[PDB]
Amino acid sequence: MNRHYLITLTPMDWFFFGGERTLDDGKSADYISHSNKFPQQSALLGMIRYQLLKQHNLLSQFPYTENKPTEKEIMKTLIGEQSFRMTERKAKSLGLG
RNA sequence: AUUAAGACAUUCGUGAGUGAUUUAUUUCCAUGAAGUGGCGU
């Protein structure tokens, strides 16, 4: 009913985890891009959602579509209807699928 | 779907320009074209 897994990630090559991308904003990029030693938990959650959408073959491919609202419902109940945001940081549930 | 995706440390570039294997050095030093007469007593 509620199965728990342990997921181990083995780096097969050199990895790069993004930073602030800038000490300011506007249009500037950073000439030196530094790698965080750890990814954000948002990255882990998005990886889980993407892999779940890969197992159940419901992926967003090539320009743009509307994804067959029944498929929209199944994707909502699989991965949730929304990404990780800190607006719902006090919500009692993860809000995902 | 995850501070994400795309991005050759690459383009142009003669190991080239000036440079006498030249300067100094006697094929020279020593050396007899010389030696001897013979026989007919």
Nearest to A15 by CA among A48, A51, A56, A43: A43
- Which nt sits closest to A80, CA to C1'? B1
The one-letter amino acid code at A48 reads I
Contact, A53 CB vs strand B, < 7 Å: yes
**Between the CA of A41 and the C1' of B19, what is the distance in angstroms?**
73
- Given a contact cutoff of 8 angstroms between Cβ atoms, the answer to whether A21 and A34 are in contact is no
Contact, A15 CB vs strand B, < 7 Å: no
- Report helix, strand or coil for A45: helix
- Residue A87 CB-half CA count within 13 A: 5
Six-digit token string for A11: 């780096």
Chain B: nucleotides under 7 Å from a protein CB? 1-4
**Determined by which method?**
cryo-EM
CA distance A52 to A46: 10
Nearest to A80 by CA among A64, A61, A59, A94: A94
First and final C-alpha spacing in chain A: 14
Length of chain A: 97
- Report helix, strand or coil for A3: coil
CA distance A27 to A73: 37
